[PDB]
């Protein structure tokens, strides 16, 4: 299971 | 800065004339991800060839497996033709 | 024994040809089990291994939304990197991410990963401590400052120590028939004369799983690392892998050469010779 990206670059 | 594909053409199992097998073309070590791969039967493009989902290695270089069901014979010659931004001409690797 | 779970993300811009495509693929060891492609007619997280099929509707619906939102984040990131690297809007660029965890035979965390590349070059990576970052250049330092201020590493650590380990443990159990089976290589040595005084000895390994393998040639019991042609391990398409190693030998000296095979599936390493 993968989650959302925590934060953008 | 781009990386040219390494190419291997081979069968799923050791080839036996008259026996159903799979013809593979494995492209690896390339960057960027866009690539063109054809499987050839006596110089002609094989239709509805399938491929694996885009993925990559620890070094970020991409890999793909192209494959199709085939029954090899003594007369039939198989190959893979590959085009990538790094190549001036498509590269043809024959199945041994 | 030991196992890994990995997700491989690839986002590629294509100026003039719509928005960047996003692909996410998931693996347990060398077995792919999920895919998402934003270019699919109806983008959705799809099963790619039989042991994941039992996951309920909540699994697929949650993962599809996560990948749809992620698709947008990577499009934003490709825009951001055009600014950080002072690039034009004309060219195609790529962002890649590898994330996952490794566990030992007891299922305990060995280590976690969260790393990214831009145009196939390292960009930013979460260090093994899961608390600090390695930025490849002054552009990745801007992301590092942004991620330190928002305590992003703490959030990544939580996923890697919890969710990642917990789900890898679940998948290994649900797929125990295959994920926890090592298929040893089927091996043989071929001989082909190249001329009157040289011949090729090729050592084959077929039908093995996992992909990790060591194939070597020795001459008089000495490793021939520099004189061996070693092809990359390649998938057969039926879950198994293949590899070969070849040496060019002087005619009449074939019996001085030995092929050595190491694989998880082998209780002891194999020694092979050309059997005329």
Author numbering:
A (entry chain C): 1 to 9
B (entry chain B): 1 to 96
C (entry chain A): 1 to 276
Q: Any passages from the paper?
A:
Two major variants; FEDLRVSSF (NP338-L7S) and FEDLRLLSF (NP338-V6L) were dominant in H1N1, pH1N1, H5N1, and H7N9 or H3N2 strains, respectively, representing 93–100% of the distinct strains and were thus selected in addition to the previously published (WT) peptide for further analysis. In addition, the peptides adopted a similar conformation as the NP338 peptide with an r.m.s.d. of 0.12 and 0.09 Å, respectively. The P7-Leu residue sits above Trp147, with its side chain interacting with Ala150, Val152, and Lys146. The EM2 TCR bound to NP338-L7S with a similar affinity to the one observed for the NP338 bound to HLA-B37 (Kd ~ 150 µM). This might explain the similar affinity observed for the EM2 TCR towards both peptides (Kd ~ 130–150 µM).
Our previous work identified NP338 as an immunodominant CD8+ T cell epitope in individuals expressing HLA-B3739. Our conservation analysis of the NP338 viral peptides across vaccine and circulating IAV strains, including pH1N1, H5N1, and H7N9, found 16 natural variants of NP338 peptide, with the most common mutations occurring at position (P) 5, 6, and 7 of the peptide. Thus our data demonstrate that CD8+ T cell cross-reactivity in the context of NP338 peptide and its variants is favored by similar conformations adopted by the epitopes.
